[PDB]
Design a protein around this ligand. Structure first.
Ligand code: LMT
Ligand code: LMT
Ligand code: LMT
Ligand code: DDR
Ligand code: DDQ
Ligand code: D12
Ligand code: D12
Ligand code: D10
Ligand code: OCT
Ligand code: HEX
Ligand code: HEX
Ligand code: HEX
Lengths: 1034, 155, 48, 48
């Protein structure tokens, strides 16, 4: 194939042009996102039951829905929580590769058929089924600066005037409102209701009658009386539209004729649908929109489109309304693309410089400058073909492949230059002979590298999805590199290189290059002399190799493992957790302190604090809150002191002083779509109807035992909430019946006043919105307020709640959990320092086996993922090792010579481990993929040394030592050229300290150290491997 | 109190060893949460016998009442903690204490069918004719619940 | 049933249309709301 | 037909349409299937 294209350079250019056009087309069409989809598909069912406690939700909603989640395909597990805010979320998680649309419609359809079994109030609210995803493209905040608008005012404005246009913006896949549109709020007064012998039942009945749509019919409708000249619709009652109309609702006409209106027993206003969340932006009322990117969209184009649409809305904002951007990934994504394009350009420049330093003619420097861009462009085309996106992972995959691509270019061109200088052949004949020496090895190298990287794409679950991004990117680039090395670069060598006189090694030149050539020719002889001495005493170096292997293993075991490195993404969170039963106002005081700290003690770093009172990932409620801290640009936060990790550490220590509150700051995970993915995720399960209290006792037993093994387990804790005091009120049926008071009036009066009631809908400025009745705050605060609520008996007398009820304090759960349909409690934890998560999981299982009868367990989430990925790894390693050996055996026509190549593996790994350990990094995904590309390139170096040596022995009858020395002599220059270019090319990644430097550091450090030791050690150890192996197997 | 809150928590959780340390350091045995429950309330509710004894040795009010008039004896009798009922009564618990509803420990023990506790309460002078706010006695409760064994004990 | 075009547009058509975002391959969407209370919303997708 | 027009008025127009095809175009038109109360704008009495 090389000879074919040496004689057909135009055909070769045509292939290059086609590749470049396909790649150019792909760069224009390719989606762009920070990360691709990694987590297994998950569907969430969400329902709301206003005023309901956790057990009411669980036992009238959650259990019913769970019992109907049957006959759905590809389900891995199901989990739910039911909480005291009246909310249930059920999450169904499906096998990787499941079609997320099919999973969701199957869930939705089973739900539809369970709706008749749910309470009317829940049917009325409705039950949402959505694909689960924690990846936001950006969060647009909406604030009011002139103090003229409440958060409810802002949320309604956003809903009515912004949300829909954003949802229609190009690339927007979903938009979530942080708040609600207005609701008509009727705040009842029990004293006035009693004065007129009325109850919330009467209020609800009147609203349903006087705020309604009523069908009528038509004038002159069919079948008509013939001769009718006009046909017209009749319009009758239509829904109310204003607070004024609701206040005029008629409740009662008194004997004297006076009228009782709704405004006589209630305050009436537009307000929020719920009041559990208080959202502030630097102390100012706020709402916002969480925006997700649409499938296949371009994150950069979508962010720009969103901003352009928000600009068009600006002229219509009320006074004081301002847009803010507390979270936006696209600045980061833009820096990543810029940095990666920079790395690739600089890498091409460095190859140009190294090519001129050693070869000292510009015509040769142009050949890699053409070949490498062609390969990169073709890689984008294959990426598009496979349906991949331009994202953090695929981009760094191409960076990690740079050495391999640069090497194919250097190897092909350098070998032709050597052949010409050693035999005086013309470029065309030299390229023919040169390609004949390396073409078989290039193909074997392609197969060997495929055997290394392809199995990496067959890990399952989330880690497999991550690995697959690197695997497909690297294999594709590597495969195109070899195609280009066999098709294009030979044609370029034959047509572009100028001849070299036999024996001409530039030693006769003057100036720097003449001095350089003499220096390098002399250094080559020093090199071959050293290898001669090495080969005179190999046993000593076999000992040193075993030392390296042992030091590798040792350093490997001690190197802490993680998944993806933390980044200074310009944002971080502050958890605020107050004791149980703490009220909203108390949480707000703490949040104010938190906000005040960041805007005073961190005023040079912090741009904003988005304080959310009432929301907590561990559970919702008045006693929990989050403060989302948005920082100023990296360019204004110079030095580690002004980075998230330092700011976070300072904040957490500063907040240790806070009394009656747990307040701490932490950074975000790299992939927010996933959790921390560090530690384990354990489910304790009630397998025999034990009940909540017995399950809690069994949980505590397990937590106490786990605390007795600090050497193995750390921070083993429940993920949920503890039981809290609740107010148990018993209605006395006998007394209710004796007084003629119906239980429905009692329970409606209690629930509507103290929990609130969604009555029906009205139309506010053309938009349908909800009507809620609820007690004004001051009549539903304390137990003594219960007795101020009256119910009308059948005989007209008003009866206070005290007359037919009794109450007592008891404990109950504010958040009940279930797992695969059974009561459960989720437990988080992590392995102690130096211990593996697998070992920590083993102990957890041992401890769980000693719990009371009926208590089981399961692994979920990351732990479910780690067990399955681990079960695959041994067989994937084996297939890689086996196929690598077989490809080499075919390449060399020998069952033994492959070993001389495969022994190179530790030489790169040791330097990668050393650099990572010294710099304090971890064994993360970037480190691991880099190990494979370092191993790959070192294996390539050895493959060509062994190929040359073996061919000299086979064709020219040279001796084992003679051929080995001549081979390492010839391969010295190209090895050094690639290593010099590639090592310098990754240098900026190592020293980088800016945005995205976490990933850049993890890519560069291991690669640079691994390339250093792989280069130094391989040029001395590979000849040892070949000689020792040939001697052993004659 | 800081230690008052840790004692409320340790008494609920049945952490005998931690309660020991807290009694040494003088943690307030009369600390009360927002609903008026003392550590003795919490230990009686959750059935932590040893902690009930330690608290009473350290001067806890055996007849403390919550914001609805309920005492630790109410809770122990209601939830079937026989040994705690006996300890509370030996240390002076009011056997006829009425909560805001007129409900006594005998009412609650009867309602849950705790026969042994009913007899301990009666042995210590529980008023068998005590009526709650609805006029009901422990005997009315046993008849309504259909507990024949209990109805025979209440003669 | 019985609702006029404006009522059914405000209470039905707009409510549905507001949720028709983020569907793959959607070219355009057209709807009518009329005096019989009837709503029809048609979504047309890219070729293929 | 205009707003408010009846089925009877629409039938007068449909008769004229049918008449045209069955007389002026009788050499070209094989059949006419005409529907009162159904058309491209709805099912109102004024549509056909
Ligand atoms: C090295 C040899 C091979 C040459 C090709 C190597 C690089 C090819 C991949 C680069 C990524 C292409 O991705 C392309 O990035 C550019 C520059 O960020 C974006 O271009 C623009 O996007 C938006 C829209 O205004 C804004 O952020 C900004 O104006 C700009 O970044 C494109 O929307 C995106 O499609
Ligand atoms: C602990 C980390 C170590 C990392 C570095 C290891 C790789 C570095 C290899 C350096 C190789 C050069 O070192 C080479 O050593 C051999 C001995 O083996 C010397 O060889 C000497 O000893 C041998 C055997 O006794 C004689 O046959 C030979 O004539 C004599 O010169 C070479 O003259 C020297 O050039
Ligand atoms: C051209 C060069 C590139 C070609 C190389 C690519 C080859 C592709 C590899 C496909 C991987 C097959 O995937 C692998 O299948 C085997 C088949 O038993 C499964 O098998 C595994 O199951 C369990 C694991 O505890 C054991 O009982 C069993 O011994 C083990 O092999 C693995 O769990 C799965 O990971
Ligand atoms: C000393 C051993 C070094 C192993 C380093 C492996 C780090 C990558 C781990 C990973 O992601 O696994 C993917 C994949 C599993 O098949 O890794 C492998 O296959 C690693 C083995 C490839 C090297 C053997 C070939 C000899 C060179 C010529
Ligand atoms: C699947 C086996 C992969 C190994 C590739 C071996 C290629 C050697 C070709 C040798 N040659 C024909 C050029 O002389
Ligand atoms: C040149 C194309 C190389 C692409 C390698 C494909 C590997 C298949 C992996 C299957 C995905 C799980
Ligand atoms: C990776 C599995 C390779 C096993 C084959 C070993 C080859 C035998 C060596 C001796 C042949 C002369
Ligand atoms: C777009 C690349 C153009 C290639 C020029 C062809 C050079 C002459 C080959 C014989
Ligand atoms: C799976 C590899 C088999 C090779 C063994 C050959 C030894 C003579
Ligand atoms: C020798 C034939 C090569 C052609 C590949 C396109
Ligand atoms: C170079 C061949 C690629 C292998 C893909 C399975
Ligand atoms: C890797 C096994 C072969 C070693 C020869 C001594």
């Amino acid at each position: 194939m090389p000879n074919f294209f040496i004689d057909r350079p135009i055909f070769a250019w045509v292939i290059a042009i086609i590749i470049m056009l396909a790649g150019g087309l792909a760069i224009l069409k390719l989606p762009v996102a920070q990360y691709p989809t990694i987590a297994p598909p998950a569907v969430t069912i969400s329902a709301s039951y206003p005023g309901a406690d956790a057990k009411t939700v669980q036992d009238t909603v959650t259990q019913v829905i769970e019992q109907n989640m049957n006959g759905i395909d590809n389900l891995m597990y199901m989990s739910s929580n039911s909480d005291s805010t009246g909310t249930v979320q059920i999450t169904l998680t499906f096998e990787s590769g499941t079609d997320a649309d099919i999973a969701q419609v199957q869930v939705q359809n089973k739900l539809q058929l369970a709706m008749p079994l749910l309470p009317q109030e829940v049917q009325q609210q409705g039950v949402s089924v959505e694909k689960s995803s924690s990846s936001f493209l950006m969060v647009v905040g909406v604030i009011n600066t002139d103090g003229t608008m409440t958060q409810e005012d802002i949320s309604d404005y956003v809903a009515a005037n912004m949300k829909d246009a954003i949802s229609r913006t190009s690339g927007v896949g979903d938009v979530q409102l942080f708040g609600s549109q207005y609701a008509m709020r009727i705040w009842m007064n029990p004293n006035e209701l009693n004065k007129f012998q009325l109850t919330p039942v009467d209020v609800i009945t009147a609203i349903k009658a006087q705020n309604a749509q009523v069908a009528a019919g038509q004038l002159g409708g069919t079948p008509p009386v013939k001769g009718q000249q006009l046909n017209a619709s009749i319009i009758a009652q239509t829904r109310l539209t204003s607070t004024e109309e609701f206040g005029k609702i008629l409740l009662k006409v008194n004997q004297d004729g006076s009228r009782v209106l709704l405004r006589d027993v209630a305050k009436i206003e537009l307000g929020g649908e719920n009041y559990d969340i208080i959202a502030e932006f630097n102390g100012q009322p706020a709402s916002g929109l969480g925006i997700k990117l649409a499938t296949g969209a371009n994150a950069l184009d979508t962010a720009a489109a969103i901003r352009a649409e928000l600009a068009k809305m600006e002229p219509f904002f009320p006074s004081g309304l301002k847009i803010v951007y507390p979270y936006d990934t696209t600045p980061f994504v833009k820096i990543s693309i810029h940095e990666v394009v920079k790395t690739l350009v600089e890498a091409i420049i460095l190859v140009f410089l190294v090519m001129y330093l050693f070869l000292q003619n510009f015509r040769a420097t142009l050949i890699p400058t053409i070949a490498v861009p062609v390969v990169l462009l073709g890689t984008f085309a294959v990426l598009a073909a496979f349906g991949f996106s331009i994202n953090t992972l695929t981009m760094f995959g191409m960076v990690l492949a740079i050495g391999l691509l640069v090497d194919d270019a250097i190897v092909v061109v350098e070998n032709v230059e050597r052949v010409m200088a050693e035999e005086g052949l013309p470029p065309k004949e030299a390229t023919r002979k040169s390609m004949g020496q390396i073409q078989g090895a290039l193909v074997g190298i392609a197969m060997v590298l495929s055997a290394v990287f392809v199995p990496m794409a067959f890990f399952g679950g989330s880690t497999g999805a991550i690995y697959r991004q690197f695997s497909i990117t690297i294999v594709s680039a590597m495969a195109l590199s070899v195609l280009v090395a066999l098709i294009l670069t030979p044609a370029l060598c034959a047509t572009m290189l100028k001849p070299i006189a036999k024996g001409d090694h530039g030693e006769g030149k003057k100036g720097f290059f003449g001095w350089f050539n003499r220096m390098f020719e002399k250094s080559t002889h020093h090199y071959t002399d050293s290898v001669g001495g090495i080969l005179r005493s190999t046993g000593r170096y076999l000992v040193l190799y075993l030392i390296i292997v042992v030091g590798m293993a040792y350093l490997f075991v001690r190197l802490p493992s993680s998944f993806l490195p933390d980044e200074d993404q310009g944002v971080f969170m502050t958890m605020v957790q107050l004791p149980a039963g703490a009220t909203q106002e108390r949480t707000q005081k703490v949040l104010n302190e938190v906000t005040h700290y960041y805007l005073t003690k961190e005023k040079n770093n912090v741009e904003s604090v988005f304080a959310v009172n009432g929301f907590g990932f561990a559970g919702r409620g008045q006693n929990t809150g989050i403060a989302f801290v948005s920082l100023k640009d990296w360019a204004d936060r110079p030095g580690e002191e002004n980075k998230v990790e330092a700011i976070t550490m300072r904040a957490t220590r500063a907040f240790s002083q806070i009394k009656d509150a747990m307040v701490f700051a932490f950074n975000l995970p790299a992939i927010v779509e996933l959790g921390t993915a560090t530690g384990f995720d354990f489910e304790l399960i009630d397998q025999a109807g034990l009940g909540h209290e017995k399950l809690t006792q069994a949980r505590n037993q397990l937590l106490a035992e786990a605390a007795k093994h600090p050497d193995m387990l750390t921070s083993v804790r429940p993920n949920g909430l503890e039981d809290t005091p609740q107010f148990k009120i018993d209605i006395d049926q006998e007394k209710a019946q004796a007084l003629g008071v119906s239980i429905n009036d009692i329970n409606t009066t209690l629930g509507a006043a103290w929990g609130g009631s969604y009555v029906n809908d009205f139309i506010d400025r053309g938009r349908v919105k909800k009507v809620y009745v609820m007690s004004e705050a001051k009549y539903r605060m304390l137990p003594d307020d219960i007795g101020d609520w009256y119910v009308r008996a059948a005989d007209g007398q008003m009866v206070p709640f005290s007359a037919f009820s009794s109450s007592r304090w008891e404990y109950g759960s504010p958040r009940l959990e279930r797992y695969n349909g059974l009561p459960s409690m989720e437990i988080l934890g992590q392995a102690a320092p130096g211990k593996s998560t697998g070992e920590a999981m083993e102990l957890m299982e041992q401890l769980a086996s000693k719990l009371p009868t009926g208590v089981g367990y399961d692994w979920t989430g990351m732990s479910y993922q780690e067990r399955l990925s681990g079960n695959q790894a041994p067989s994937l390693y084996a297939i890689s090792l086996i196929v690598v050996f077989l490809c080499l055996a075919a390449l060399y026509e020998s069952w033994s010579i492959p070993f001389s190549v495969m022994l190179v593996v530790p030489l790169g790994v040791i330097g990668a481990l050393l650099a990572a350990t010294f710099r304090g990094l971890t064994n993360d995904v970037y480190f691991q993929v880099g190990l494979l590309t370092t191993i790959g390139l070192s294996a390539k170096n050895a493959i060509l040394i062994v190929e040359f040596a073996k061919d000299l022995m086979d064709k020219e009858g040279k001796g084992l030592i003679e051929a080995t020395l001549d081979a390492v002599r010839m391969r010295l220059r190209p090895i050094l050229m690639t290593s010099l270019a590639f090592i310098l090319g990754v240098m900026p990644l190592v020293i980088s300290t800016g945005a995205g430097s976490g990933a850049q550091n993890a890519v560069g450090t291991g690669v640079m150290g691994g390339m250093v030791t792989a280069t130094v050690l391989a040029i001395f150890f590979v000849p040892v491997f070949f000689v020792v192996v040939r001697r052993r197997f004659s | 109190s800081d230690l008052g809150k840790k004692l409320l928590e340790a008494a609920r959780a049945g952490r005998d060893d931690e309660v020991r340390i807290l009694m040494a350091n003088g943690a307030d045995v009369n600390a009360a949460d927002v609903v008026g429950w003392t550590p003795l309330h919490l230990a009686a509710y959750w059935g932590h016998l040893e902690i009930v004894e330690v608290l009473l040795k350290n001067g806890a009010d055996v007849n403390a009442y919550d914001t609805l008039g309920s005492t630790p004896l109410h809770l122990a009798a209601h939830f079937g903690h026989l040994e705690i009922v006996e300890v509370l009564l030996k240390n002076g618990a009011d056997v006829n204490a009425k909560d805001d509803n007129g409900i006594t420990p005998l009412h609650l023990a009867a309602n849950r069918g705790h026969l042994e506790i009913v007899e301990v309460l009666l042995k210590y002078g529980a008023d068998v004719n005590a009526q709650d706010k609805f006029g009901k006695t422990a005997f009315d409760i046993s008849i309504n619940n259909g507990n024949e064994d209990l109805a025979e004990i209440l003669q």
